[PDB]
Write a protein that binds this DNA or RNA. Structure first.
Ligand code: MG
Ligand code: MG
Ligand code: MG
Ligand code: MG
Ligand code: MG
Ligand code: MG
Ligand code: MG
Ligand code: MG
Ligand code: MG
Ligand code: MG
Ligand code: MG
Ligand code: MG
Ligand code: MG
Ligand code: MG
Ligand code: MG
Ligand code: MG
Ligand code: MG
Ligand code: MG
Ligand code: MG
Ligand code: MG
Ligand code: MG
Ligand code: MG
Ligand code: MG
Ligand code: MG
Ligand code: MG
Ligand code: MG
Ligand code: MG
Ligand code: MG
Ligand code: MG
Ligand code: MG
Ligand code: MG
Ligand code: MG
Ligand code: MG
Ligand code: MG
Ligand code: MG
Ligand code: MG
Ligand code: MG
Ligand code: MG
Ligand code: MG
Ligand code: MG
Ligand code: MG
Ligand code: MG
Ligand code: MG
Ligand code: MG
Ligand code: MG
Ligand code: MG
Ligand code: MG
Ligand code: MG
Ligand code: MG
Lengths: 263, 60, 206
RNA sequence: GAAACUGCGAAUGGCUCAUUAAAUCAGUUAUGGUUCCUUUGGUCGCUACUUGGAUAACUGUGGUAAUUC
RNA sequence: GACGACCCAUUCGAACGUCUGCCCUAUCAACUUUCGAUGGUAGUCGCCGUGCCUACCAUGGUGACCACGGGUGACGGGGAAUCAGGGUUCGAUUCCGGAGAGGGAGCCUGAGAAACGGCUACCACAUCCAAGGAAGGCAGCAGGCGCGCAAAUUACCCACUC
RNA sequence: UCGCUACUACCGAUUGGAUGGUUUAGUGAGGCCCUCGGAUCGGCCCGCCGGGGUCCCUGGCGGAGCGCUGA
């Protein structure tokens, strides 16, 4: 039977970009309900023992999190399967280090340490616009936040830079032809380039083009574009190799020349 | 049949037993929460009136 | 129980389908309300996801509106006359949406009088004299034409309507499912609907 | 801090393949035709220095051969 | 800070619906309908769309491009065996979807069930008795009878995944 | 063709037997809904006692319509 919501998640059926093994055991953490979709999230448990190696078994994650050390967007989260996701800024005070969840160019999250004078603001993508009771205009971002009284020029698909202690958006980039963008869905995942186009098929999945810093172009769907810069100048810091998605015939050459077989 | 007499004043009780159905006719063909004088119960109960509060069956 | 499933009945081609599962709960039926007329009797039912739902039996009063004058007043409901779907609901006086009813029409008279300072359907001049004429004619001189001439050129209640008040019963149409909102609201007949239903009532019954 | 009232969960998980041929199922799309425990963010101003009666555990008397009576 | 709470959004879903896709059978050629069959108008009901159901009205809808009836040692798919190229046969079975707890039926509580490690009744079984009454559901894990050519221990532990 | 021995299916008096499913006619447990019903348990209206105040308000005991009202 299914008569209600499920609550376990099998290890094989889990998302691929979690990069889980196969022979530990039958289950996977099953992210809890949150602001980020179940396939797009990264639970806090998978970030501390599969990536940062800080813990070793699930109980060590539970007793790291209980001591109130970890902060997800300023607030102090105690749930180990909390669904962190794209544009969230984990902070570990007791160590003095910070991170930004951004897709690496193979289409998966990777650790990306940032300077503590940067981990005070995060970007959000506008999803909806509506006028509440008494005539107040609202906003909905990709991570479920609701901003009341936003500027009357910010529209859908735009990006806004908020603060983590107030909300209260500060800057906003407008979606049009010429601005930077990072792609967050499908085949082209974690690539960067100027938008350069947008076609519009009314009633079905408008399509968007892009263009890398090496001529490479790659279409996508508009609901997968995420503007991160005014133009050619990304606001937030970037991972190494900057979304350039080199082919395997190049990846082999760099592996051979660097001879990165040790340290 | 036996009886389970109770006194809500001081909080005491006693399980008494009778057999002469003569001293049982005061109850027969009556309902619960009814009150009845215990004058036929014996010499010791004269100005005694008690309320029937239910009980059990044969088989319990 | 009773159910509103699609799968119990046959497809375009005229061929049967064999049963696919036991009746689910989300296909649930429940029986008719059949609102009668009388002193209020509203029950409630718990529906999918909490969400009280008020079933109405034995209603009496309705918040009817008068579109031309923008009036609306809690009014007693007198009777049902015509039912546009099944006729044996007027023989048993069950009160459902888009029924046709007679109401009491008194508060509309009171509003019209006090607002336009004029008389509606009356019989004589004897009853109006002992009282309520102290409202039609006033102390006022300033005001009494400064506004009551703004109420002139406008008091032209239609003939079909004016002929009704002389009995004190108005034709009205329900616009709410009593069995799902507990209330029996609606509007009062104007214009061409009036002629339609006058014809229909005079035609079928009697 | 036993017990007991209260809250929550028990609708996930596990097992099997009898039924069932436009059904189930797959890819594709739509809810502008609906509901949603929980999580996340909004929203929280048209006798009062604090009201009512009544139950369990506990004490005591019990019934039936027998029951989580 | 813990808790509770109205509504809105978000999340995990759920539900209904569109297009295309199926094994064998003509010794199944016409089927469907006041016991709703296709459609219209108004309602009932329901979480919402809807002959979903009632009242009146029309006489329609499907078929040689195989309808409708029958059979399947038929649960569907991701897949498995063999394989020059094309193909043939298998898929109860660890992932996803569905359906069911002896057979049929009805419902309580809840956000969520037509739930059976929940309740009520009939059918078939079966246990206890002081003959008044009471109690039951291994297609969970072990184990036993039966059936058959055909399938393991009535062990240990929450240390790992959750 | 006739005659022998083994095996396979066919027709058929019995109007075979059993099993399962259909189905007109009649009955129909149990739950839900509705219209009733009212076992029983309360509260406010009249005395005596204790508190306040000028007979009333509280708490208790008893009794009269138990009148009304609630579950
Ligand atoms: Mg299950
Ligand atoms: Mg089931
Ligand atoms: Mg979880
Ligand atoms: Mg709700
Ligand atoms: Mg409990
Ligand atoms: Mg619960
Ligand atoms: Mg079935
Ligand atoms: Mg068939
Ligand atoms: Mg068939
Ligand atoms: Mg289809
Ligand atoms: Mg699908
Ligand atoms: Mg489909
Ligand atoms: Mg909870
Ligand atoms: Mg909240
Ligand atoms: Mg219709
Ligand atoms: Mg309709
Ligand atoms: Mg025909
Ligand atoms: Mg034809
Ligand atoms: Mg067929
Ligand atoms: Mg198969
Ligand atoms: Mg089968
Ligand atoms: Mg091959
Ligand atoms: Mg299979
Ligand atoms: Mg089988
Ligand atoms: Mg098996
Ligand atoms: Mg399965
Ligand atoms: Mg599905
Ligand atoms: Mg069995
Ligand atoms: Mg609940
Ligand atoms: Mg059941
Ligand atoms: Mg179960
Ligand atoms: Mg039970
Ligand atoms: Mg039983
Ligand atoms: Mg069992
Ligand atoms: Mg077993
Ligand atoms: Mg054997
Ligand atoms: Mg074997
Ligand atoms: Mg064996
Ligand atoms: Mg464990
Ligand atoms: Mg022979
Ligand atoms: Mg022979
Ligand atoms: Mg034969
Ligand atoms: Mg037979
Ligand atoms: Mg028969
Ligand atoms: Mg019947
Ligand atoms: Mg009955
Ligand atoms: Mg009945
Ligand atoms: Mg009643
Ligand atoms: Mg009553």
């Amino acid at each position: 039977m299914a008569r209600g919501p499920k609550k376990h998640l099998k290890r094989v059926a889990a998302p691929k970009h979690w990069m889980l093994d196969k022979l530990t055991s039958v289950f996977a953490p099953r992210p809890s309900t949150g602001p980020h979709k179940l396939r797009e999230c990264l639970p806090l448990i998978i970030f501390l023992r599969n990536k940062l190696k800080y813990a070793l078994t699930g109980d060590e994650v539970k007793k790291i999190c209980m001591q109130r050390f970890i902060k997800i967007d300023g607030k102090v989260r105690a749930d180990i399967t909390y669904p962190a996701g794209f544009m969230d800024v984990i902070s570990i005070d007791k160590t003095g280090e910070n991170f930004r969840l951004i897709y690496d160019t193979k289409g998966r999250f990777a650790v990306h340490r940032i300077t503590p004078e940067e981990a005070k603001y995060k970007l959000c993508k506008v999803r909806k616009i509506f006028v509440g009771t008494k005539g107040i205009p609202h906003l909905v971002t990709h991570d479920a936040r609701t901003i009341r009284y936003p500027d009357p020029l910010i529209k859908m698909n735009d990006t806004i830079q908020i603060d983590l202690e107030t909300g209260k958006i500060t800057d906003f980039i407008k979606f049009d032809t010429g601005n930077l963008c990072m792609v967050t869905g499908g085949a082209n995942l974690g690539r960067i380039g100027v938008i350069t186009n947008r076609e519009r098929h009314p009633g079905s999945f408008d399509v968007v083009h892009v263009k890398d810093a090496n001529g490479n172009s790659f279409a996508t769907r508009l609901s997968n574009i995420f503007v991160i810069g005014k133009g050619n100048k990304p606001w937030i810091s970037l991972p190494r190799g900057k979304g350039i998605r080199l082919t395997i015939a190049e990846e082999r050459d760099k592996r051979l020349a660097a001879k990165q077989s040790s340290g | 049949m036996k009886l389970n007499i109770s006194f809500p004043a001081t909080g005491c009780q006693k399980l008494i037993e009778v057999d002469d159905e003569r001293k049982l006719r005061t109850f027969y063909e009556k309902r619960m929460a009814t009150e009845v004088a215990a004058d036929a119960l014996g010499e010791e109960w004269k100005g005694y009136v008690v309320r029937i509060s239910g009980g059990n069956d044969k088989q319990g | 129980g009773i159910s509103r499933d699609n799968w119990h009945k046959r497809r375009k081609t005229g061929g049967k389908r064999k049963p696919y599962h036991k009746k689910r709960k989300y296909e649930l039926g429940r029986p008719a309300a059949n609102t009668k007329i009388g002193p209020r009797r509203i029950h409630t039912v718990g529906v999918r996801g909490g969400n009280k739902k008020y079933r109405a039996l034995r209603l009496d009063v309705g918040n009817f509106s008068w579109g031309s004058e923008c009036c609306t007043r809690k009014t007693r409901i007198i009777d049902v006359v015509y039912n546009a779907s099944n006729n044996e609901l007027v023989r048993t006086k069950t009160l459902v949406k888009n029924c046709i009813v007679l109401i009491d029409s008194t508060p509309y008279r009171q509003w019209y009088e006090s607002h336009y300072a004029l008389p509606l359907g009356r019989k004589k001049g004897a009853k109006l004299t002992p009282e309520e004429e102290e409202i039609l004619n006033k102390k006022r001189s300033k005001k009494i034409q400064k506004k009551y001439d703004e109420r002139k050129k406008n008091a032209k209640i239609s003939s079909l309507l004016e002929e009704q008040f002389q009995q004190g019963k108005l034709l009205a149409c329900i616009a709410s499912r009593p069995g799902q909102c507990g209330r029996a609201d609606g509007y009062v007949l104007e214009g061409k609907e009036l002629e339609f239903y006058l014809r229909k009532i005079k035609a079928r019954k009697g």
